[PDB]
Amino acid sequence: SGFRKMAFPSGKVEGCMVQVTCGTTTLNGLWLDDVVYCPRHVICTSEDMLNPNYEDLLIRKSNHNFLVQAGNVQLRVIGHSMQNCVLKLKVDTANPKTPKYKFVRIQPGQTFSVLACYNGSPSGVYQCAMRPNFTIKGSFLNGSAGSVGFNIDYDCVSFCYMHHMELPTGVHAGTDLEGNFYGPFVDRQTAQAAGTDTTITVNVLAWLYAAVINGDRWFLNRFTTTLNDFNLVAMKYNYEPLTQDHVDILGPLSAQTGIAVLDMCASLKELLQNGMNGRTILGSALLEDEFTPFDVVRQCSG
Amino acid sequence: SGFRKMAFPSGKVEGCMVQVTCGTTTLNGLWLDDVVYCPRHVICTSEDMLNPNYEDLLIRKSNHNFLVQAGNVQLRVIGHSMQNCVLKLKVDTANPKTPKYKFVRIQPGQTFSVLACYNGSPSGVYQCAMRPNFTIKGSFLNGSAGSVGFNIDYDCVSFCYMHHMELPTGVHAGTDLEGNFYGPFVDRQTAQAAGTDTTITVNVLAWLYAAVINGDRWFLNRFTTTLNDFNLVAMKYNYEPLTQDHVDILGPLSAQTGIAVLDMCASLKELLQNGMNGRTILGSALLEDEFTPFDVVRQCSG
């Protein structure tokens, strides 16, 4: 029993992190087979970020402008190319620690682990969710660009995120591993802001089920409700609307606890309209929305 | 910027986890050089736990009663011995992935990362604190015994915790790596309960500094207070008393923010006497006490 913000073990990813230096800019890269992936703004000077033309900046570089370091070993750059917002650096040595991997793009509301890195060196691991406004509420300092987010699926590392920048509000924006941004952001210094964030309703419900499984029951009630009456209240409190697919996804947790989804929705409706009244749920005084149904099952069953 | 519950990268520890089977009991072990460390209750049957005599149970075993598996490889047990509440299994092969390591015993209020494992296989990583009552609020299912807690100190893994059991209240108890329990617990099924937990005051203060660094300032005030007047209020709310050593430890955060410790204590005194009034601090509606001053510096400076 117990319930924690749990990340995937990072060992398989740690062996792929490298340092990439171009000019006076150094950040992190991901070394898989004989390719190093890193944010394309490594080729920018401190002044280039105001309004970069990456095609021009790249043609003015050659392979020897790129210093790639894997621990103490130097990797020789053999070729380079740009794919959307990522640089692909071909190197002379294939990473012998290359795990089985996939590149996947995730959806808002899904979670992943982040391996925060500096100078190519892993510093910490934490769990977060892709927000409905396509930002993540990460923890990143200057130099963390190129850090990656991932899930582990049996033996296979699914890479889903590469960090590029922090927005003025203190949240974080990045790309998938094909270089395509999450959300309407660009890798240049402007006045971009994130849109309105909402609460991930299916995740809040999954977490209430985790609470019941761990013996927190004070918020349950006898009432039930319909999908339509719930969503009407959810809209008023900035909660994502709830669909029949969400209900199906929560099935395993409903089965294990004997509490129907629409019954749990009635409890959620109550907590939104009355608050928590100084009670807590799994050690929190707010409703948590960064655990998926799958996260809960993994932690409360195996 | 941002602030997360951040664990250490687990790669160096993942390479040391093995599965240990004795009879029908299988749990996790830690394989360092040519020794596998695991909880001694692996030698107990489901009925032995009621009142075990470990000296008797161990003399009735031989090396071949112990099945040690490192992935697909079988490790041959060459000898065994008991050290306090841990078994030391001598094996024929030294772990080639043995990191530089130390065995250290930690103090209440200190934090560490936990690599939760099942059947010798790493499942997740999370951060927690040793509570003042010598329990940890972990997340563990049946079969997690032998999972370890650790800190990373530059290149060196400091092992500080091995998991043994869950108490009736849902919290967790274990030993250091020399087999000595944290707290007044024993590895046998009785009616042991944890004593009263208190809030780790120096950690709450460190976290308020992390909030200020990240732009949360609404709880600050002009007042100041003395060590003695604060501790009088702290006692009433079940907070650990605050000492001059704590003040010194918080120095770097006071320096970086320009807010003196005793000034921050005055803000804490206010939050205890009036509550948070529906405001949050770093995304929490409760005062968090599981980040040390060192955790904050690591995350908010580097």
Coordinates of C-alpha atoms in Angstrom, one line a residue:
Chain A
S1 CA 0.0 0.0 0.0
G2 CA 0.8 3.7 -0.2
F3 CA 0.8 6.0 -3.2
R4 CA 3.7 8.1 -4.6
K5 CA 4.6 10.1 -7.7
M6 CA 6.6 7.2 -9.2
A7 CA 8.9 7.5 -12.2
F8 CA 10.2 4.7 -14.4
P9 CA 13.8 3.4 -13.7
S10 CA 16.0 5.6 -15.8
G11 CA 19.0 3.2 -16.3
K12 CA 18.3 2.5 -20.0
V13 CA 18.0 6.2 -20.8
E14 CA 21.1 7.3 -18.7
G15 CA 23.3 5.3 -21.1
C16 CA 22.1 7.4 -24.1
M17 CA 22.8 10.9 -22.7
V18 CA 25.7 12.9 -24.2
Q19 CA 26.9 16.4 -24.2
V20 CA 26.7 18.5 -27.4
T21 CA 28.7 21.7 -27.8
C22 CA 28.6 24.1 -30.7
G23 CA 30.4 27.3 -30.3
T24 CA 29.8 28.5 -26.7
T25 CA 26.5 26.7 -26.5
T26 CA 26.4 23.3 -24.8
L27 CA 23.3 21.2 -24.1
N28 CA 22.3 17.5 -23.9
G29 CA 21.8 15.0 -26.7
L30 CA 20.3 11.6 -27.1
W31 CA 22.7 9.0 -28.6
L32 CA 20.9 6.0 -30.2
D33 CA 22.7 3.7 -32.7
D34 CA 25.0 6.1 -34.6
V35 CA 22.8 9.2 -34.4
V36 CA 22.8 12.0 -31.7
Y37 CA 19.5 13.9 -31.4
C38 CA 19.5 17.4 -29.8
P39 CA 17.6 20.7 -30.0
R40 CA 18.5 22.6 -33.2
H41 CA 19.0 25.8 -31.2
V42 CA 22.4 24.5 -30.1
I43 CA 23.6 26.2 -33.3
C44 CA 22.4 29.6 -32.2
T45 CA 24.4 32.3 -30.4
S46 CA 22.9 34.1 -27.5
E47 CA 21.9 36.8 -30.0
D48 CA 20.6 34.5 -32.7
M49 CA 17.6 33.4 -30.6
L50 CA 15.8 36.7 -31.1
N51 CA 15.0 35.8 -34.7
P52 CA 16.9 32.8 -36.0
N53 CA 17.0 31.5 -39.6
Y54 CA 18.0 27.9 -39.0
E55 CA 18.6 27.0 -42.6
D56 CA 21.2 29.8 -42.9
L57 CA 22.8 29.1 -39.5
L58 CA 23.2 25.4 -40.4
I59 CA 24.7 25.8 -43.9
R60 CA 27.5 27.9 -42.2
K61 CA 28.5 24.9 -40.0
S62 CA 30.6 21.9 -40.7
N63 CA 30.9 18.5 -38.9
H64 CA 33.9 19.8 -36.9
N65 CA 31.9 22.7 -35.4
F66 CA 30.1 20.0 -33.3
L67 CA 31.8 18.7 -30.2
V68 CA 30.0 15.5 -28.9
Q69 CA 31.2 14.0 -25.7
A70 CA 30.0 10.7 -24.1
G71 CA 31.5 10.9 -20.7
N72 CA 35.2 11.1 -21.3
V73 CA 35.0 9.7 -24.9
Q74 CA 34.8 12.1 -27.8
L75 CA 32.4 11.1 -30.6
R76 CA 33.4 12.1 -34.2
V77 CA 30.6 13.8 -36.1
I78 CA 30.4 12.3 -39.6
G79 CA 27.4 14.2 -40.9
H80 CA 24.5 16.4 -39.8
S81 CA 21.0 17.2 -40.8
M82 CA 18.0 19.0 -39.5
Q83 CA 14.6 17.4 -39.0
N84 CA 12.0 20.0 -38.0
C85 CA 13.2 21.4 -34.7
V86 CA 15.8 18.6 -33.9
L87 CA 19.4 18.2 -35.2
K88 CA 20.4 14.7 -36.2
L89 CA 24.2 14.3 -35.8
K90 CA 25.6 11.2 -37.5
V91 CA 28.6 9.9 -35.5
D92 CA 31.2 7.3 -36.2
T93 CA 30.3 5.0 -33.3
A94 CA 27.0 3.3 -32.7
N95 CA 26.0 3.5 -29.0
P96 CA 26.5 -0.1 -27.6
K97 CA 24.1 0.7 -24.8
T98 CA 21.2 1.5 -27.3
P99 CA 18.0 0.0 -25.8
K100 CA 15.1 -1.2 -27.7
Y101 CA 13.2 2.0 -28.4
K102 CA 10.3 3.7 -30.2
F103 CA 9.5 7.3 -30.9
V104 CA 5.9 8.1 -29.9
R105 CA 3.9 11.3 -29.6
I106 CA 1.7 11.4 -26.5
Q107 CA -1.7 13.0 -25.9
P108 CA -2.6 15.7 -23.3
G109 CA -3.3 14.0 -20.0
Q110 CA -0.8 11.2 -20.5
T111 CA 2.2 10.9 -18.1
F112 CA 5.9 10.2 -18.6
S113 CA 9.2 10.3 -16.7
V114 CA 11.7 13.0 -17.3
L115 CA 15.4 12.5 -16.9
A116 CA 16.8 16.0 -16.2
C117 CA 20.4 16.3 -17.5
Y118 CA 23.1 19.0 -17.4
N119 CA 26.3 18.9 -19.5
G120 CA 25.3 15.5 -20.7
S121 CA 25.1 14.2 -17.1
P122 CA 21.9 12.8 -15.6
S123 CA 20.8 14.8 -12.5
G124 CA 17.4 13.6 -11.4
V125 CA 14.2 11.8 -12.5
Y126 CA 10.6 12.8 -12.0
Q127 CA 7.1 12.1 -13.3
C128 CA 4.8 14.7 -15.0
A129 CA 1.9 14.9 -17.3
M130 CA 1.4 16.6 -20.7
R131 CA -1.1 19.4 -19.8
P132 CA -4.2 20.1 -22.0
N133 CA -2.4 23.3 -23.1
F134 CA 0.6 21.2 -24.4
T135 CA 3.0 22.5 -21.7
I136 CA 4.6 20.5 -18.9
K137 CA 5.0 21.7 -15.3
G138 CA 8.6 20.6 -15.1
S139 CA 11.6 21.4 -13.0
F140 CA 14.4 22.6 -15.3
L141 CA 17.3 25.0 -15.0
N142 CA 19.4 26.7 -17.7
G143 CA 21.3 24.0 -19.7
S144 CA 18.6 21.3 -19.4
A145 CA 17.6 21.5 -23.1
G146 CA 17.9 18.1 -24.7
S147 CA 16.7 16.3 -21.6
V148 CA 14.1 13.6 -22.6
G149 CA 10.8 12.2 -21.4
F150 CA 10.0 8.6 -21.7
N151 CA 7.9 5.6 -20.8
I152 CA 9.0 2.0 -20.4
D153 CA 6.8 -0.6 -22.1
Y154 CA 8.1 -4.0 -20.9
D155 CA 11.6 -4.0 -22.4
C156 CA 11.1 -1.0 -24.8
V157 CA 11.8 2.6 -24.1
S158 CA 9.2 4.9 -25.7
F159 CA 10.7 8.3 -26.1
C160 CA 8.0 11.0 -26.2
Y161 CA 9.5 14.3 -25.3
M162 CA 12.7 16.4 -25.7
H163 CA 13.0 19.6 -23.7
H164 CA 13.6 22.8 -25.6
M165 CA 12.7 25.9 -23.5
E166 CA 11.0 27.5 -20.6
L167 CA 8.1 29.9 -21.2
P168 CA 7.7 33.2 -19.3
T169 CA 5.2 31.7 -16.9
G170 CA 7.7 29.2 -15.7
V171 CA 6.3 26.1 -17.5
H172 CA 8.1 24.1 -20.2
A173 CA 7.7 23.4 -23.9
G174 CA 9.3 20.8 -26.2
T175 CA 9.0 18.5 -29.1
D176 CA 8.5 14.9 -29.9
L177 CA 11.6 13.1 -31.1
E178 CA 10.8 13.8 -34.7
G179 CA 11.3 17.5 -33.9
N180 CA 7.6 18.6 -33.9
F181 CA 6.6 20.9 -31.1
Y182 CA 3.9 20.0 -28.6
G183 CA 1.5 23.0 -28.8
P184 CA 1.8 26.2 -30.8
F185 CA 5.3 27.1 -29.7
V186 CA 8.4 27.9 -31.7
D187 CA 12.1 27.7 -30.7
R188 CA 12.8 31.4 -30.9
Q189 CA 12.6 34.2 -28.3
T190 CA 9.3 35.9 -28.7
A191 CA 6.2 36.7 -26.5
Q192 CA 4.6 33.2 -26.8
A193 CA 2.3 32.3 -23.9
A194 CA 0.5 29.1 -23.0
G195 CA -3.3 29.0 -23.4
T196 CA -5.7 28.2 -20.5
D197 CA -5.0 25.0 -18.7
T198 CA -7.8 22.8 -17.5
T199 CA -8.0 19.9 -15.0
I200 CA -7.7 16.3 -16.4
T201 CA -10.9 14.8 -15.2
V202 CA -10.3 11.2 -16.0
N203 CA -7.0 11.4 -14.0
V204 CA -8.7 12.9 -11.0
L205 CA -11.2 10.0 -11.1
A206 CA -8.3 7.5 -11.3
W207 CA -6.7 9.1 -8.3
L208 CA -10.0 8.9 -6.2
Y209 CA -10.0 5.2 -7.0
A210 CA -6.4 5.0 -5.8
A211 CA -7.5 6.6 -2.5
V212 CA -10.4 4.1 -2.0
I213 CA -8.0 1.3 -2.7
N214 CA -5.7 2.8 0.1
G215 CA -8.6 3.2 2.6
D216 CA -9.6 6.8 2.1
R217 CA -13.4 6.7 1.7
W218 CA -14.8 9.7 3.5
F219 CA -15.8 11.4 0.2
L220 CA -18.0 8.6 -1.1
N221 CA -21.7 8.9 -1.2
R222 CA -24.9 7.0 -2.1
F223 CA -25.9 9.1 -5.1
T224 CA -25.2 8.5 -8.7
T225 CA -25.3 10.7 -11.8
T226 CA -25.3 10.7 -15.6
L227 CA -22.5 11.5 -17.9
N228 CA -24.4 14.6 -19.0
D229 CA -25.2 16.1 -15.6
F230 CA -21.6 15.6 -14.5
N231 CA -20.1 17.3 -17.5
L232 CA -22.4 20.3 -17.0
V233 CA -20.8 20.8 -13.5
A234 CA -17.3 19.9 -14.8
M235 CA -17.5 22.7 -17.4
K236 CA -18.1 25.3 -14.7
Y237 CA -15.0 24.4 -12.8
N238 CA -12.6 24.1 -15.8
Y239 CA -12.5 20.3 -15.9
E240 CA -12.1 18.4 -19.1
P241 CA -15.4 16.9 -20.2
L242 CA -15.8 13.1 -19.6
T243 CA -16.6 10.6 -22.4
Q244 CA -17.7 7.0 -22.6
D245 CA -14.1 6.1 -23.5
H246 CA -12.9 7.5 -20.2
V247 CA -15.6 5.4 -18.4
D248 CA -14.4 2.3 -20.2
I249 CA -10.8 3.1 -19.3
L250 CA -11.7 3.3 -15.6
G251 CA -13.4 -0.1 -15.8
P252 CA -10.6 -2.1 -14.1
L253 CA -10.6 0.3 -11.1
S254 CA -14.4 0.2 -10.8
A255 CA -14.2 -3.6 -10.9
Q256 CA -11.5 -3.8 -8.3
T257 CA -13.3 -1.4 -5.8
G258 CA -17.0 -2.2 -6.6
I259 CA -17.7 1.5 -7.1
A260 CA -19.2 2.4 -10.5
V261 CA -17.7 5.2 -12.5
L262 CA -20.9 7.3 -12.4
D263 CA -21.1 6.7 -8.7
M264 CA -17.5 8.1 -8.3
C265 CA -18.5 11.0 -10.6
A266 CA -21.2 11.9 -8.1
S267 CA -18.6 12.1 -5.3
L268 CA -16.4 14.3 -7.5
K269 CA -19.4 16.6 -8.3
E270 CA -19.7 17.0 -4.5
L271 CA -16.0 17.8 -3.8
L272 CA -16.1 20.5 -6.6
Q273 CA -19.2 22.2 -5.1
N274 CA -18.3 22.0 -1.4
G275 CA -14.5 21.6 -1.3
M276 CA -12.5 19.3 0.9
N277 CA -13.5 21.0 4.2
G278 CA -10.1 20.6 5.7
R279 CA -9.9 16.9 4.9
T280 CA -7.2 15.3 2.8
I281 CA -7.1 12.6 0.2
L282 CA -3.9 10.5 -0.1
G283 CA -2.0 13.2 1.8
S284 CA -3.2 16.0 -0.5
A285 CA -5.6 18.9 0.1
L286 CA -6.2 19.4 -3.6
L287 CA -7.5 17.1 -6.3
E288 CA -4.6 15.6 -8.2
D289 CA -4.8 15.1 -11.9
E290 CA -1.3 13.8 -13.0
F291 CA -1.9 10.1 -12.5
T292 CA -3.6 8.2 -15.3
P293 CA -5.7 5.1 -14.8
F294 CA -2.7 3.1 -16.0
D295 CA -0.4 4.7 -13.4
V296 CA -2.8 3.8 -10.6
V297 CA -3.1 0.1 -11.7
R298 CA 0.7 -0.2 -12.0
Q299 CA 1.1 1.1 -8.5
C300 CA -1.9 -0.4 -6.8
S301 CA -1.9 -3.9 -8.4
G302 CA 1.4 -4.4 -10.2
Chain B
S1 CA 12.4 27.0 -12.6
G2 CA 9.7 24.7 -11.3
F3 CA 9.9 22.3 -8.4
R4 CA 9.2 18.6 -8.4
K5 CA 9.7 15.6 -6.1
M6 CA 12.9 14.6 -7.8
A7 CA 14.7 11.2 -7.3
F8 CA 18.3 10.3 -8.1
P9 CA 18.9 8.5 -11.4
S10 CA 18.7 4.8 -10.6
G11 CA 20.9 3.2 -13.3
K12 CA 23.8 2.4 -10.9
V13 CA 21.5 0.6 -8.5
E14 CA 19.4 -1.2 -11.2
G15 CA 22.5 -3.2 -12.1
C16 CA 22.7 -4.6 -8.6
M17 CA 19.2 -5.9 -8.1
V18 CA 18.7 -9.7 -8.1
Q19 CA 16.0 -12.2 -7.2
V20 CA 16.5 -14.4 -4.2
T21 CA 14.3 -17.5 -3.7
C22 CA 14.3 -19.8 -0.7
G23 CA 11.6 -22.4 -0.6
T24 CA 8.4 -20.8 -1.8
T25 CA 9.5 -17.3 -0.7
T26 CA 11.1 -15.0 -3.3
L27 CA 12.2 -11.4 -2.8
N28 CA 14.8 -8.9 -3.9
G29 CA 18.5 -8.8 -3.1
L30 CA 21.4 -6.4 -3.6
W31 CA 24.4 -7.9 -5.3
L32 CA 27.7 -6.0 -4.6
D33 CA 31.1 -7.5 -5.4
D34 CA 30.6 -11.2 -4.5
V35 CA 27.9 -10.8 -1.8
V36 CA 24.1 -10.7 -2.2
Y37 CA 22.3 -8.8 0.7
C38 CA 18.6 -9.6 1.4
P39 CA 16.2 -9.6 4.3
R40 CA 16.7 -12.6 6.5
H41 CA 13.0 -13.4 6.5
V42 CA 13.4 -14.9 3.1
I43 CA 14.2 -18.1 5.1
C44 CA 10.8 -18.1 6.7
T45 CA 7.7 -19.9 5.7
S46 CA 4.3 -18.2 5.7
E47 CA 3.8 -19.7 9.2
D48 CA 7.3 -19.0 10.5
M49 CA 6.7 -15.2 10.7
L50 CA 4.4 -15.5 13.7
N51 CA 7.4 -16.1 15.9
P52 CA 10.6 -17.0 14.1
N53 CA 13.9 -18.2 15.6
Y54 CA 16.2 -17.2 12.9
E55 CA 19.3 -19.0 14.3
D56 CA 17.4 -22.3 14.1
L57 CA 15.9 -21.6 10.7
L58 CA 19.3 -20.8 9.3
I59 CA 21.2 -23.8 10.6
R60 CA 18.6 -26.0 8.8
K61 CA 19.6 -24.5 5.5
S62 CA 22.4 -25.1 3.1
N63 CA 23.9 -23.1 0.2
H64 CA 21.7 -25.0 -2.4
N65 CA 18.5 -24.0 -0.6
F66 CA 19.1 -20.4 -2.0
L67 CA 18.2 -19.7 -5.6
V68 CA 19.8 -16.4 -6.7
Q69 CA 19.0 -15.1 -10.2
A70 CA 20.5 -12.1 -11.9
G71 CA 18.2 -11.7 -14.9
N72 CA 18.5 -15.0 -16.8
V73 CA 21.9 -15.9 -15.1
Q74 CA 21.9 -18.1 -12.1
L75 CA 24.4 -17.2 -9.3
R76 CA 25.9 -20.1 -7.3
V77 CA 25.7 -19.6 -3.6
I78 CA 29.1 -20.4 -2.0
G79 CA 28.4 -19.5 1.6
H80 CA 25.9 -17.7 3.8
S81 CA 25.8 -15.8 7.0
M82 CA 23.4 -13.7 9.0
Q83 CA 24.3 -10.1 10.1
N84 CA 21.6 -8.7 12.3
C85 CA 18.4 -8.7 10.2
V86 CA 20.1 -9.2 6.8
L87 CA 21.4 -12.3 5.1
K88 CA 24.8 -12.1 3.4
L89 CA 25.0 -14.7 0.6
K90 CA 28.5 -15.3 -0.8
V91 CA 28.3 -16.1 -4.5
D92 CA 30.9 -17.3 -7.0
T93 CA 30.7 -14.3 -9.3
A94 CA 31.5 -10.7 -8.4
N95 CA 29.0 -8.2 -9.8
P96 CA 30.9 -6.5 -12.7
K97 CA 28.5 -3.6 -12.5
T98 CA 29.3 -2.9 -8.8
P99 CA 29.4 0.9 -8.4
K100 CA 31.5 2.7 -5.9
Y101 CA 29.4 2.6 -2.8
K102 CA 29.1 3.2 0.9
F103 CA 26.7 1.9 3.6
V104 CA 25.4 4.9 5.7
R105 CA 22.7 5.2 8.3
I106 CA 20.5 8.3 7.8
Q107 CA 18.8 10.5 10.4
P108 CA 15.1 11.3 10.6
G109 CA 14.2 14.2 8.3
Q110 CA 16.8 13.2 5.6
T111 CA 15.6 12.1 2.2
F112 CA 16.5 9.4 -0.2
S113 CA 15.4 7.7 -3.4
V114 CA 13.8 4.3 -3.3
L115 CA 14.1 1.8 -6.2
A116 CA 11.0 -0.4 -5.8
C117 CA 11.6 -3.9 -7.2
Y118 CA 9.6 -7.1 -7.7
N119 CA 11.1 -10.5 -8.5
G120 CA 14.5 -8.8 -8.7
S121 CA 13.2 -6.5 -11.4
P122 CA 13.1 -2.7 -11.0
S123 CA 9.6 -1.2 -11.3
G124 CA 9.8 2.4 -10.2
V125 CA 11.8 5.1 -8.5
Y126 CA 10.5 7.7 -6.0
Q127 CA 11.7 10.1 -3.3
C128 CA 10.8 10.0 0.4
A129 CA 12.0 11.1 3.8
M130 CA 12.8 9.1 6.9
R131 CA 10.0 10.2 9.3
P132 CA 10.8 11.3 12.9
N133 CA 9.1 8.1 14.1
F134 CA 11.6 6.0 11.9
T135 CA 9.0 4.9 9.3
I136 CA 8.8 5.9 5.7
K137 CA 5.6 6.7 3.8
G138 CA 6.5 4.5 0.9
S139 CA 4.6 2.8 -1.9
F140 CA 5.2 -0.9 -1.8
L141 CA 3.2 -4.1 -2.6
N142 CA 3.7 -7.7 -1.6
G143 CA 7.1 -8.9 -2.8
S144 CA 8.9 -5.6 -2.5
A145 CA 11.1 -6.6 0.4
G146 CA 14.8 -6.2 -0.4
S147 CA 14.2 -3.0 -2.4
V148 CA 16.8 -0.4 -1.4
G149 CA 17.0 3.4 -0.7
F150 CA 20.0 5.4 -1.7
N151 CA 21.5 8.7 -2.3
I152 CA 24.1 9.5 -5.0
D153 CA 27.1 11.6 -3.8
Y154 CA 29.0 12.5 -7.0
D155 CA 30.1 9.1 -8.3
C156 CA 29.3 7.2 -5.1
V157 CA 26.1 5.4 -4.2
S158 CA 25.3 5.7 -0.5
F159 CA 22.9 2.9 0.4
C160 CA 20.9 3.8 3.5
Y161 CA 17.7 1.6 3.5
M162 CA 16.5 -1.9 2.7
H163 CA 12.8 -2.5 2.8
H164 CA 11.5 -5.3 5.1
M165 CA 7.8 -4.9 5.9
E166 CA 4.6 -2.9 6.0
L167 CA 3.1 -1.9 9.3
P168 CA -0.7 -2.2 10.0
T169 CA -1.1 1.6 9.4
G170 CA 0.2 1.3 5.9
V171 CA 3.6 2.8 6.4
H172 CA 6.9 1.0 5.9
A173 CA 9.8 -0.2 8.1
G174 CA 13.3 -1.4 7.2
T175 CA 17.0 -1.6 8.1
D176 CA 20.2 0.0 7.2
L177 CA 22.5 -2.2 5.1
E178 CA 24.2 -3.6 8.2
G179 CA 20.8 -5.2 9.1
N180 CA 19.9 -2.8 12.0
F181 CA 16.3 -1.6 12.0
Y182 CA 15.3 2.0 11.8
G183 CA 13.0 2.5 14.8
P184 CA 11.8 0.0 17.4
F185 CA 10.6 -2.6 14.9
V186 CA 11.4 -6.3 14.5
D187 CA 11.0 -8.7 11.5
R188 CA 8.2 -10.8 12.9
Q189 CA 4.5 -10.6 12.8
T190 CA 3.2 -8.9 16.0
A191 CA 1.2 -5.9 17.0
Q192 CA 4.0 -3.3 16.5
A193 CA 2.8 0.2 15.8
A194 CA 4.6 3.4 14.9
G195 CA 4.8 6.2 17.5
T196 CA 3.5 9.7 16.9
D197 CA 4.8 11.4 13.8
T198 CA 5.8 15.1 13.8
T199 CA 6.4 17.6 11.0
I200 CA 10.0 18.2 10.0
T201 CA 10.3 22.0 10.6
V202 CA 13.7 22.7 8.9
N203 CA 12.3 21.0 5.8
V204 CA 9.2 23.1 5.8
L205 CA 11.4 26.2 6.0
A206 CA 13.6 24.9 3.1
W207 CA 10.4 24.4 1.0
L208 CA 9.2 28.0 1.7
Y209 CA 12.5 29.2 0.4
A210 CA 12.0 27.1 -2.7
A211 CA 8.7 28.8 -3.1
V212 CA 10.2 32.3 -2.8
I213 CA 12.9 31.4 -5.4
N214 CA 10.1 30.3 -7.7
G215 CA 8.0 33.5 -7.3
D216 CA 5.5 32.5 -4.5
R217 CA 5.7 35.4 -2.0
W218 CA 2.2 36.0 -0.7
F219 CA 3.0 34.5 2.7
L220 CA 5.9 36.7 3.6
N221 CA 5.6 39.5 6.1
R222 CA 7.5 42.3 7.8
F223 CA 7.7 40.7 11.2
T224 CA 10.6 38.7 12.7
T225 CA 10.8 36.4 15.7
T226 CA 13.3 34.6 18.0
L227 CA 14.2 31.0 18.1
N228 CA 12.4 30.6 21.4
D229 CA 9.1 32.3 20.5
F230 CA 8.9 30.2 17.3
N231 CA 9.6 26.9 19.0
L232 CA 6.8 27.6 21.5
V233 CA 4.3 27.8 18.7
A234 CA 5.9 24.9 16.8
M235 CA 5.4 22.6 19.8
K236 CA 1.7 23.3 19.9
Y237 CA 1.3 22.2 16.2
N238 CA 3.4 19.0 16.4
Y239 CA 6.4 20.6 14.6
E240 CA 10.0 19.5 15.5
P241 CA 11.7 22.2 17.4
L242 CA 14.2 24.4 15.6
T243 CA 17.9 24.7 16.5
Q244 CA 20.8 26.9 15.7
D245 CA 22.2 24.1 13.5
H246 CA 19.1 24.2 11.4
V247 CA 19.4 28.0 11.1
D248 CA 23.0 27.6 9.9
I249 CA 22.0 24.9 7.4
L250 CA 19.4 27.2 5.9
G251 CA 22.1 29.9 5.4
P252 CA 22.6 29.4 1.6
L253 CA 18.9 29.8 1.0
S254 CA 18.7 32.9 3.2
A255 CA 21.7 34.3 1.4
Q256 CA 20.2 33.6 -2.1
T257 CA 16.8 35.1 -1.3
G258 CA 17.8 37.9 1.1
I259 CA 15.2 36.7 3.7
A260 CA 16.6 35.9 7.1
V261 CA 15.7 32.5 8.7
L262 CA 14.0 34.1 11.7
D263 CA 12.1 36.3 9.2
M264 CA 10.9 33.2 7.4
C265 CA 10.1 31.6 10.8
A266 CA 7.7 34.5 11.4
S267 CA 5.9 33.7 8.2
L268 CA 5.7 30.0 9.2
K269 CA 4.3 31.0 12.6
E270 CA 1.5 32.9 10.7
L271 CA 0.6 30.0 8.4
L272 CA 0.3 27.7 11.3
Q273 CA -2.0 30.0 13.2
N274 CA -4.2 31.1 10.3
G275 CA -3.9 28.4 7.7
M276 CA -3.5 29.0 4.0
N277 CA -6.9 30.6 3.4
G278 CA -7.4 28.8 0.1
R279 CA -4.0 29.9 -1.3
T280 CA -1.4 27.4 -2.5
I281 CA 2.4 27.3 -2.3
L282 CA 4.3 25.5 -5.1
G283 CA 1.0 23.8 -6.2
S284 CA 0.3 22.5 -2.7
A285 CA -2.4 23.4 -0.2
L286 CA -0.5 21.8 2.7
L287 CA 3.0 22.6 4.1
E288 CA 5.4 20.1 2.6
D289 CA 8.2 18.7 4.8
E290 CA 9.9 16.1 2.7
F291 CA 12.5 18.3 1.0
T292 CA 15.7 19.0 2.8
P293 CA 17.7 22.3 2.5
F294 CA 20.1 20.2 0.3
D295 CA 17.3 19.0 -2.0
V296 CA 16.2 22.6 -2.6
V297 CA 19.7 23.8 -3.4
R298 CA 20.2 20.9 -5.8
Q299 CA 17.0 21.7 -7.6
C300 CA 17.0 25.5 -7.5
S301 CA 20.7 26.1 -8.2
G302 CA 22.4 23.0 -9.4

